[PDB]
Amino acid sequence: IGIRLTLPPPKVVDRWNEKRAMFGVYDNIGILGNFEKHPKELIRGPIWLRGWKGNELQRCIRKRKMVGSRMFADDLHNLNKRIRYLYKHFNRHGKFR
Amino acid sequence: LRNRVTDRYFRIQEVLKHARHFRGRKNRCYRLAVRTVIRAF
């Protein structure tokens, strides 16, 4: 009974909307523009993970470092607790050692 | 619930179809049907 008895409404996807059509343009901004702009400068998102990558612990550390002062009180408390828990997990638990 | 299973009905039926000719709840309840169908095979 965990199965729907009717077909879901058809999902129409416009493969040629502007976003899809122009997707990827300027990905080669660096190599095709005398390296004035790095491709990572095209990344739009959280200030603490623009052109950067890491596991959850590194992401949380970077978030606290870069926007920790601007975080809300309980969000910052949760981030501190998450960093603490992730430190304990990655530095004290696991199959390999 | 990013990824949720949607075939569980058919996964259950794959066993219940073989279990349909048993006695008691072994032909209806998957938890019981699977054990007896494995024994049958």
Partner: peptide, 26 residues
């Protein structure tokens, strides 16, 4: 509701099969 279309299509096909078996057309 579970997002997806393939399981729903399969269940519709099975329902059609069962309906045909119960009341086969002339």
């Amino acid at each position: 509701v579970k997002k997806g279309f393939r399981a729903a299509f399969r269940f519709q096909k099975e329902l059609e099969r069962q309906r045909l078996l119960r009341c086969p057309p002339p």
